Amino acid sequence: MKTAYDVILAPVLSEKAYAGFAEGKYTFWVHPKATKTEIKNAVETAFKVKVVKVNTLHVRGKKKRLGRYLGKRPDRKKAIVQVAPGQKIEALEGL
Amino acid sequence: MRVKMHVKKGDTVLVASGKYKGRVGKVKEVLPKKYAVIVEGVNIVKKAVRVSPKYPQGGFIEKEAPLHASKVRPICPACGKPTRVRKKFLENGKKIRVCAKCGGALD
Amino acid sequence: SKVCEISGKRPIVANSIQRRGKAKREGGVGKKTTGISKRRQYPNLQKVRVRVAGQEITFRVAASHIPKVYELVERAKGLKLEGLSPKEIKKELLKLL
Amino acid sequence: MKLSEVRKQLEEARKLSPVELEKLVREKKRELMELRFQASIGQLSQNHKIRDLKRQIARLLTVLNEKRRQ
RNA sequence: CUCUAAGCACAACCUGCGGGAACCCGUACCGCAAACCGACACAGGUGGGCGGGUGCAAGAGCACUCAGGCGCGCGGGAGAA
RNA sequence: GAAUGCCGGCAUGAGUAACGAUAAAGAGGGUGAGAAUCCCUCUCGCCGUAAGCCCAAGGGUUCCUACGCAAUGGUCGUCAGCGUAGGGUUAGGCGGGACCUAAGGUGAAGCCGAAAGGCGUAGCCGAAGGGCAGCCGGUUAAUAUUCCGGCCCUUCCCGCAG
RNA sequence: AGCCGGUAGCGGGCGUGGAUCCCUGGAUGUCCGAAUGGGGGAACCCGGCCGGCGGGAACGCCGGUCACCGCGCGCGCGGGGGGAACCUGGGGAACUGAAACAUCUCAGUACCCAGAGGAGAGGAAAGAGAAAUCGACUCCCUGAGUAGCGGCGAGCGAAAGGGGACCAGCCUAAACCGUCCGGCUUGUCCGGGCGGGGUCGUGGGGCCCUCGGACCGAAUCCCCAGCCUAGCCGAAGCUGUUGGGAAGCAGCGCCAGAGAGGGUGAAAGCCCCGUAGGCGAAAGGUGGGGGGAUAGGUGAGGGUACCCGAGUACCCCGUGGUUCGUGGAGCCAUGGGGGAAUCUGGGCGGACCACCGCCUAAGGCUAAGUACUCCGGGUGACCGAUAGCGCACCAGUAC
Ligand SMILES: [Mg+2]
Ligand SMILES: [Mg+2]
Ligand SMILES: [Mg+2]
Ligand SMILES: [Mg+2]
Ligand SMILES: [Mg+2]
Ligand SMILES: [Mg+2]
Ligand SMILES: [Mg+2]
Ligand SMILES: [Mg+2]
Ligand SMILES: [Mg+2]
Ligand SMILES: [Mg+2]
Ligand SMILES: [Mg+2]
Ligand SMILES: [Mg+2]
Ligand SMILES: [Mg+2]
Ligand SMILES: [Mg+2]
Ligand SMILES: [Mg+2]
Ligand SMILES: [Mg+2]
Ligand SMILES: [Mg+2]
Ligand SMILES: [Mg+2]
Ligand SMILES: [Mg+2]
Ligand SMILES: [Mg+2]
Ligand SMILES: [Mg+2]
Ligand SMILES: [Mg+2]
Ligand SMILES: [Mg+2]
Ligand SMILES: [Mg+2]
Ligand SMILES: [Mg+2]
Ligand SMILES: [Mg+2]
Ligand SMILES: [Mg+2]
Ligand SMILES: [Mg+2]
Ligand SMILES: [Mg+2]
Ligand SMILES: [Mg+2]
Ligand SMILES: [Mg+2]
Ligand SMILES: [Mg+2]
Ligand SMILES: [Mg+2]
Ligand SMILES: [Mg+2]
Ligand SMILES: [Mg+2]
Ligand SMILES: [Mg+2]
Ligand SMILES: [Mg+2]
Ligand SMILES: [Mg+2]
Ligand SMILES: [Mg+2]
Ligand SMILES: [Mg+2]
Ligand SMILES: [Mg+2]
Ligand SMILES: [Mg+2]
Ligand SMILES: [Mg+2]
Ligand SMILES: [Mg+2]
Ligand SMILES: [Mg+2]
Ligand SMILES: [Mg+2]
Ligand SMILES: [Mg+2]
Ligand SMILES: [Mg+2]
Ligand SMILES: [Mg+2]
Ligand SMILES: [Mg+2]
Ligand SMILES: [Mg+2]
Ligand SMILES: [Mg+2]
Ligand SMILES: [Mg+2]
Ligand SMILES: [Mg+2]
Ligand SMILES: [Mg+2]
Ligand SMILES: [Mg+2]
Ligand SMILES: [Mg+2]
Ligand SMILES: [Mg+2]
Ligand SMILES: [Mg+2]
Ligand SMILES: [Mg+2]
Ligand SMILES: [Mg+2]
Ligand SMILES: [Mg+2]
Ligand SMILES: [Mg+2]
Ligand SMILES: [Mg+2]
Ligand SMILES: [Mg+2]
Ligand SMILES: [Mg+2]
Ligand SMILES: [Mg+2]
Ligand SMILES: [Mg+2]
Ligand SMILES: [Mg+2]
Ligand SMILES: [Mg+2]
Ligand SMILES: [Mg+2]
Ligand SMILES: [Mg+2]
Ligand SMILES: [Mg+2]
Ligand SMILES: [Mg+2]
Ligand SMILES: [Mg+2]
Ligand SMILES: [Mg+2]
Ligand SMILES: [Mg+2]
Ligand SMILES: [Mg+2]
Ligand SMILES: [Mg+2]
Ligand SMILES: [Mg+2]
Ligand SMILES: [Mg+2]
Ligand SMILES: [Mg+2]
Ligand SMILES: [Mg+2]
Ligand SMILES: [Mg+2]
Ligand SMILES: [Mg+2]
Ligand SMILES: [Mg+2]
Ligand SMILES: [Mg+2]
Ligand SMILES: [Mg+2]
Ligand SMILES: [Mg+2]
Ligand SMILES: [Mg+2]
Ligand SMILES: [Mg+2]
Ligand SMILES: [Mg+2]
Ligand SMILES: [Mg+2]
Ligand SMILES: [Mg+2]
Ligand SMILES: [Mg+2]
Ligand SMILES: [Mg+2]
Ligand SMILES: [Mg+2]
Ligand SMILES: [Mg+2]
Ligand SMILES: [Mg+2]
Ligand SMILES: [Mg+2]
Ligand SMILES: [Mg+2]
Ligand SMILES: [Mg+2]
Ligand SMILES: [Mg+2]
Ligand SMILES: [Mg+2]
Ligand SMILES: [Mg+2]
Ligand SMILES: [Mg+2]
Ligand SMILES: [Mg+2]
Ligand SMILES: [Mg+2]
Ligand SMILES: [Mg+2]
Ligand SMILES: [Mg+2]
Ligand SMILES: [Mg+2]
Ligand SMILES: [Mg+2]
Ligand SMILES: [Mg+2]
Ligand SMILES: [Mg+2]
Ligand SMILES: [Mg+2]
Ligand SMILES: [Mg+2]
Ligand SMILES: [Mg+2]
Ligand SMILES: [Mg+2]
Ligand SMILES: [Mg+2]
Ligand SMILES: [Mg+2]
Ligand SMILES: [Mg+2]
Ligand SMILES: [Mg+2]
Ligand SMILES: [Mg+2]
Ligand SMILES: [Mg+2]
Ligand SMILES: [Mg+2]
Ligand SMILES: [Mg+2]
Ligand SMILES: [Mg+2]
Ligand SMILES: [Mg+2]
Ligand SMILES: [Mg+2]
Ligand SMILES: [Mg+2]
Ligand SMILES: [Mg+2]
Ligand SMILES: [Mg+2]
Ligand SMILES: [Mg+2]
Ligand SMILES: [Mg+2]
Ligand SMILES: [Mg+2]
Ligand SMILES: [Mg+2]
Ligand SMILES: [Mg+2]
Ligand SMILES: [Mg+2]
Ligand SMILES: [Mg+2]
Ligand SMILES: [Mg+2]
Ligand SMILES: [Mg+2]
Ligand SMILES: [Mg+2]
Ligand SMILES: [Mg+2]
Ligand SMILES: [Mg+2]
Ligand SMILES: [Mg+2]
Ligand SMILES: [Mg+2]
Ligand SMILES: [Mg+2]
Ligand SMILES: [Mg+2]
Ligand SMILES: [Mg+2]
Ligand SMILES: [Mg+2]
Ligand SMILES: [Mg+2]
Ligand SMILES: [Mg+2]
Ligand SMILES: [Mg+2]
Ligand SMILES: [Mg+2]
Ligand SMILES: [Mg+2]
Ligand SMILES: [Mg+2]
Ligand SMILES: [Mg+2]
Ligand SMILES: [Mg+2]
Ligand SMILES: [Mg+2]
Ligand SMILES: [Mg+2]
Ligand SMILES: [Mg+2]
Ligand SMILES: [Mg+2]
Ligand SMILES: [Mg+2]
Ligand SMILES: [Mg+2]
Ligand SMILES: [Mg+2]
Ligand SMILES: [Mg+2]
Ligand SMILES: [Mg+2]
Ligand SMILES: [Mg+2]
Ligand SMILES: [Mg+2]
Ligand SMILES: [Mg+2]
Ligand SMILES: [Mg+2]
Ligand SMILES: [Mg+2]
Ligand SMILES: [Mg+2]
Ligand SMILES: [Mg+2]
Ligand SMILES: [Mg+2]
Ligand SMILES: [Mg+2]
Ligand SMILES: [Mg+2]
Ligand SMILES: [Mg+2]
Ligand SMILES: [Mg+2]
Ligand SMILES: [Mg+2]
Ligand SMILES: [Mg+2]
Ligand SMILES: [Mg+2]
Ligand SMILES: [Mg+2]
Ligand SMILES: [Mg+2]
Ligand SMILES: [Mg+2]
Ligand SMILES: [Mg+2]
Ligand SMILES: [Mg+2]
Ligand SMILES: [Mg+2]
Ligand SMILES: [Mg+2]
Ligand SMILES: [Mg+2]
Ligand SMILES: [Mg+2]
Ligand SMILES: [Mg+2]
Ligand SMILES: [Mg+2]
Ligand SMILES: [Mg+2]
Ligand SMILES: [Zn+2]
């Protein structure tokens, strides 16, 4: 059955995602089929926050090889949610 | 369906062929995939090891080599002789391995 | 150039044979075929429009079975048909086939 | 997860109402996400726990589906 | 924008103000080219817009030069036919 | 043993022709096992209705960074559009869709054809045409009319007033 | 009794409270695809209705539902598409052969299309054709390269009969009777439904009189055996010697309904896996065999002359099929034209006529014996990496 924890996969662990913690923009990897509105509700019921702004982008899987064998990494999608003034998602503040 | 094993960890077996013919040992491990067993203190090989956290200073280590399962025979914990294995149906009616020389259980 | 709704008469394939000479029967050397090719012999379809339950129904029918369209109309008197479309009525007639 | 514990999970699972089942899944689904996050930062050495929870959620839903289907 | 028809005229529409709501896909990099079409890091081919200054009658011509970009992925000598 | 036979391997021509625009180089300094060939500086030369810059097509990670040099690079290589890894593409207003139609395509009604199928007013699809609301600056190694700053605007839902 | 696939490693777990694994049934099954809410450049996009989720009216997500066509009184059942060959049907070449070429051949082949199905077609005589005879059909052998066909060239090429495989026969239409329904030209009406009756070639049936009053039995259904989809039991050897290694050699034994074959450090009946001989299914599939039910099946005379499949038979024109190419050209089929009869009817026995026989057209169905090999197994005087499938290897791939 579909829940919020099915929509949010893992947080984005990179120098650029960290920079957004300062201003309350958190960055998660999300399921590629999930809508902005869908991602809003999900982060909200997951972390008890108020989502004011959601920006999403797709990330192509990098093509890689093992000697003889050419292949592709799974395609991903990340979302950057803006929580309300003063709010925080502590789990990601982690760091 | 599954490989037939007349021997298992860790009943006692005679090595009846090869360089260790006649030795007796416990079945340390059974590798059904390769159809081979590991018999304690039998088939010792010298393997080289790189200097590591595992083996600093390094050099060599002694290891037991796998033996073709056919080269090994279980010993009867009753009569004490090397034997072939039979099967026997109990009243349960589960089946057990039994010695062919005497009717001993072999577990 | 098509199919008889009543009889199923269809276009068929026939040969057109070309012959020279005098038949043996009339004292001749014999008939030689100077050509054969395929051709089609079509049914003789015509339109048959009849009014049935106050509706206009039309049939594509080989001339041979033209009166068979009327026998249907005659047989169609025992059926409650009024109010239907011509498409439906035609199906009902054809069921009497 | 242990065999005996599986049987035990099933007995107690089959006694729940759908709603209790639905609620139970949601939590174990939430725990899966919690596991995934720590897995991300290399802070989950007992990684077998991930496979384990996935199958619990599976076993629950299978039973949720049991409850509804006849 | 306007006109009316079924309808509806506690509805409906227009205007002003407020609060709320606003999804999916693209966006990296080359792009007159070593990243496109030509089997090649190929003197070929590829649509649109910007394209400064001075001088030469004009100009998108021509010479030099701005910003910007390059010296073209083998070199060193010799000084014959 | 021959079929200008077939598949493969290895010779000869031969250290020969060539190394792909005659825009052009020189030195110093640095790095490194190794440097004409990578980085840095200075000097010299070439393009400038381009050999600069921005869009569309097409290509599809080639982008940025770290670590590398077997092969790819017509030489060399410490460099690279190359190997490994990690990072990177953020929109109600830009482009396309939730709008419109063009040739054409498809196609209720209807017509036609052995079968397969061919047609066909309406409608539907179809765009680089019509239509529609964002401008300037800052920030990143790498994105920006997308994030941030400032000042603006659009549609939809509900309410209130006229 | 090990296990977490090929796959070891890091990092962690599971199993005699029966894991891994194998078989059966079930659950889940994103998106596209017949693809079916609509659109579309397949795997993307966009909607209606009902119900749910969020603060939720806008926005979004979840669940269900919504294409078209056919048949049957909005609702139901069905249809669609795929499958290596095999099958039927609707279309249908050419090279080539004729030592040129046109009739002819290749060949109703290749191929296209439509439909079937585990098969398909065909099938219970309007047959054969001379036997005073046979008796559905299919399939093999023979008949026979015969009879014939043929620019009587090249070539093409049957059937009856005989030997076999298998075996099986049925349901309707019409007369007449009954009932529901509707028509307008009111009933002894015409017609359409459903039921009863009826199914034949020694002709049969309907109707009317006389007499006569349980055996069969499915191709349907149910049960069962048997089989398939995992499996299990399974006789008999030790010591020495050479050698890295015994299964070689030596010595002394032993099994055999098992001495097929593969393995194990070399060459093993007795070490392993097997083999001979046996055993095995809760579940699903099958079930042509065994049992049982059910549908269905069943008299004889005399009279009557009601019925016995229509644009049909039949004749003529144009063709195809057959061995038959226009030939003395019948037969079967039918595109055009003309156009009957119901047993004192009609077709056939190679123009036609007579005599003599055979057969019952114009409705439908029907196992088995036959074809093929995507798939599983068994066996080779079959290949052994240029061979064998294009592929022994991550191949319909790279290119
Ligand atoms: Mg689900
Ligand atoms: Mg940064
Ligand atoms: Mg909220
Ligand atoms: Mg976006
Ligand atoms: Mg992957
Ligand atoms: Mg076993
Ligand atoms: Mg030995
Ligand atoms: Mg010994
Ligand atoms: Mg058991
Ligand atoms: Mg003619
Ligand atoms: Mg003649
Ligand atoms: Mg004469
Ligand atoms: Mg002739
Ligand atoms: Mg007329
Ligand atoms: Mg006619
Ligand atoms: Mg006529
Ligand atoms: Mg389990
Ligand atoms: Mg009104
Ligand atoms: Mg007004
Ligand atoms: Mg407003
Ligand atoms: Mg949408
Ligand atoms: Mg997007
Ligand atoms: Mg961009
Ligand atoms: Mg850009
Ligand atoms: Mg470039
Ligand atoms: Mg550029
Ligand atoms: Mg040019
Ligand atoms: Mg240009
Ligand atoms: Mg350029
Ligand atoms: Mg070229
Ligand atoms: Mg190129
Ligand atoms: Mg070429
Ligand atoms: Mg190229
Ligand atoms: Mg170059
Ligand atoms: Mg070029
Ligand atoms: Mg040009
Ligand atoms: Mg100028
Ligand atoms: Mg001057
Ligand atoms: Mg001037
Ligand atoms: Mg001048
Ligand atoms: Mg001038
Ligand atoms: Mg000029
Ligand atoms: Mg110029
Ligand atoms: Mg110049
Ligand atoms: Mg200047
Ligand atoms: Mg400069
Ligand atoms: Mg140069
Ligand atoms: Mg240079
Ligand atoms: Mg010289
Ligand atoms: Mg020779
Ligand atoms: Mg040559
Ligand atoms: Mg040669
Ligand atoms: Mg020569
Ligand atoms: Mg050759
Ligand atoms: Mg040769
Ligand atoms: Mg060759
Ligand atoms: Mg060669
Ligand atoms: Mg050479
Ligand atoms: Mg020289
Ligand atoms: Mg020379
Ligand atoms: Mg020379
Ligand atoms: Mg060259
Ligand atoms: Mg030279
Ligand atoms: Mg050059
Ligand atoms: Mg040069
Ligand atoms: Mg020049
Ligand atoms: Mg230098
Ligand atoms: Mg230097
Ligand atoms: Mg260098
Ligand atoms: Mg160097
Ligand atoms: Mg430099
Ligand atoms: Mg200029
Ligand atoms: Mg693009
Ligand atoms: Mg390319
Ligand atoms: Mg690459
Ligand atoms: Mg970039
Ligand atoms: Mg890169
Ligand atoms: Mg670069
Ligand atoms: Mg570097
Ligand atoms: Mg290199
Ligand atoms: Mg080198
Ligand atoms: Mg390397
Ligand atoms: Mg190279
Ligand atoms: Mg090189
Ligand atoms: Mg080159
Ligand atoms: Mg090198
Ligand atoms: Mg270096
Ligand atoms: Mg490069
Ligand atoms: Mg790189
Ligand atoms: Mg904005
Ligand atoms: Mg919408
Ligand atoms: Mg549109
Ligand atoms: Mg439109
Ligand atoms: Mg069309
Ligand atoms: Mg079709
Ligand atoms: Mg049109
Ligand atoms: Mg529209
Ligand atoms: Mg459009
Ligand atoms: Mg447009
Ligand atoms: Mg436009
Ligand atoms: Mg716009
Ligand atoms: Mg738009
Ligand atoms: Mg503005
Ligand atoms: Mg940039
Ligand atoms: Mg950036
Ligand atoms: Mg802004
Ligand atoms: Mg008001
Ligand atoms: Mg693995
Ligand atoms: Mg470990
Ligand atoms: Mg059990
Ligand atoms: Mg299953
Ligand atoms: Mg689908
Ligand atoms: Mg669809
Ligand atoms: Mg829907
Ligand atoms: Mg469609
Ligand atoms: Mg709703
Ligand atoms: Mg809601
Ligand atoms: Mg939701
Ligand atoms: Mg839905
Ligand atoms: Mg079909
Ligand atoms: Mg089909
Ligand atoms: Mg045919
Ligand atoms: Mg057809
Ligand atoms: Mg034909
Ligand atoms: Mg043709
Ligand atoms: Mg010919
Ligand atoms: Mg030929
Ligand atoms: Mg010949
Ligand atoms: Mg010829
Ligand atoms: Mg010839
Ligand atoms: Mg010729
Ligand atoms: Mg010819
Ligand atoms: Mg031939
Ligand atoms: Mg023929
Ligand atoms: Mg055919
Ligand atoms: Mg064929
Ligand atoms: Mg089909
Ligand atoms: Mg069969
Ligand atoms: Mg059949
Ligand atoms: Mg019959
Ligand atoms: Mg004979
Ligand atoms: Mg002759
Ligand atoms: Mg023929
Ligand atoms: Mg016969
Ligand atoms: Mg016979
Ligand atoms: Mg037989
Ligand atoms: Mg009647
Ligand atoms: Mg009546
Ligand atoms: Mg009646
Ligand atoms: Mg009679
Ligand atoms: Mg029957
Ligand atoms: Mg055994
Ligand atoms: Mg044995
Ligand atoms: Mg020795
Ligand atoms: Mg021995
Ligand atoms: Mg001996
Ligand atoms: Mg034997
Ligand atoms: Mg043997
Ligand atoms: Mg053997
Ligand atoms: Mg060896
Ligand atoms: Mg021997
Ligand atoms: Mg031998
Ligand atoms: Mg053996
Ligand atoms: Mg047996
Ligand atoms: Mg057996
Ligand atoms: Mg009687
Ligand atoms: Mg009569
Ligand atoms: Mg008859
Ligand atoms: Mg008829
Ligand atoms: Mg006749
Ligand atoms: Mg005729
Ligand atoms: Mg003929
Ligand atoms: Mg003749
Ligand atoms: Mg004839
Ligand atoms: Mg006759
Ligand atoms: Mg005839
Ligand atoms: Mg005719
Ligand atoms: Mg007569
Ligand atoms: Mg007669
Ligand atoms: Mg006849
Ligand atoms: Mg006859
Ligand atoms: Mg005669
Ligand atoms: Mg006859
Ligand atoms: Mg049939
Ligand atoms: Mg049978
Ligand atoms: Mg059959
Ligand atoms: Mg059969
Ligand atoms: Mg096979
Ligand atoms: Mg061999
Ligand atoms: Mg090979
Ligand atoms: Mg091969
Ligand atoms: Mg070899
Ligand atoms: Mg194969
Ligand atoms: Mg390959
Ligand atoms: Zn014993």
From Swiss-Prot, chain A:
Ribosomal protein in keyword set: yes
Example of a GO biological process term: translation
Record-annotated membrane-spanning stretches: none
SUPFAM superfamilies per UniProt: Ribosomal proteins S24e, L23 and L15e
Gene3D superfamilies: 3.30.70.330
GO MF, one annotated term: structural constituent of ribosome
Family statement drawn from the similarity comment of this UniProt entry: Belongs to the universal ribosomal protein uL23 family.
Subunit structure: Contacts protein L29, and trigger factor when it is bound to the ribosome. Part of the 50S ribosomal subunit.
Descriptive protein name: Large ribosomal subunit protein uL23
Annotated source species: Thermus thermophilus (strain ATCC 27634 / DSM 579 / HB8)
Lineage: Bacteria, Thermotogati, Deinococcota, Deinococci, Thermales
Swiss-Prot record, chain B:
Molecular-function annotations in GO: rRNA binding; structural constituent of ribosome
Pfam families: KOW (PF00467), ribosomal_L24 (PF17136)
Ribonucleoprotein recorded as keyword: yes
Keywords, alphabetical: Ribonucleoprotein, Ribosomal protein, RNA-binding, rRNA-binding
GO biological process per UniProt: translation
UniProt subunit comment: Part of the 50S ribosomal subunit.
HAMAP family: Ribosomal_uL24_B (MF_01326_B)
Protein name: Large ribosomal subunit protein uL24
Organism: Thermus thermophilus (strain ATCC 27634 / DSM 579 / HB8)
Swiss-Prot record, chain C:
Gene Ontology terms for molecular function: structural constituent of ribosome
Annotated GO CC locations: ribonucleoprotein complex; ribosome
Keyword check for Ribonucleoprotein: yes
Ribonucleoprotein as UniProt keyword: yes
Keyword entries, A-Z: Ribonucleoprotein, Ribosomal protein
Source superkingdom: Bacteria
GO biological process, one term: translation
Similarity comment text for this entry: Belongs to the bacterial ribosomal protein bL28 family.
Self-association and partners: Part of the 50S ribosomal subunit.
Descriptive protein name: Large ribosomal subunit protein bL28
Organism of origin: Thermus thermophilus (strain ATCC 27634 / DSM 579 / HB8)
Swiss-Prot record, chain D:
PANTHER family: 60S RIBOSOMAL PROTEIN L35/50S RIBOSOMAL PROTEIN L29 (PTHR10916), LARGE RIBOSOMAL SUBUNIT PROTEIN UL29C (PTHR10916:SF0)
Known role: One of the proteins that surrounds the polypeptide exit tunnel on the outside of the subunit.
Complex formation: Part of the 50S ribosomal subunit.
Similarity comment: family membership: Belongs to the universal ribosomal protein uL29 family.
CDD domains: Ribosomal_L29_HIP
Name under which the protein is recorded: Large ribosomal subunit protein uL29
GO annotation (BP), single: translation
Gene3D superfamilies xref list: 1.10.287.310
Record's keyword terms, sorted: Ribonucleoprotein, Ribosomal protein
Molecular function via GO: structural constituent of ribosome
Pfam families: Ribosomal_L29
InterPro entries recorded: Ribosomal_protein_uL29 (IPR050063), Ribosomal_uL29 (IPR001854), Ribosomal_uL29_CS (IPR018254), Ribosomal_uL29_sf (IPR036049)
GO cellular component: cytosolic large ribosomal subunit
NCBIfam families: L29
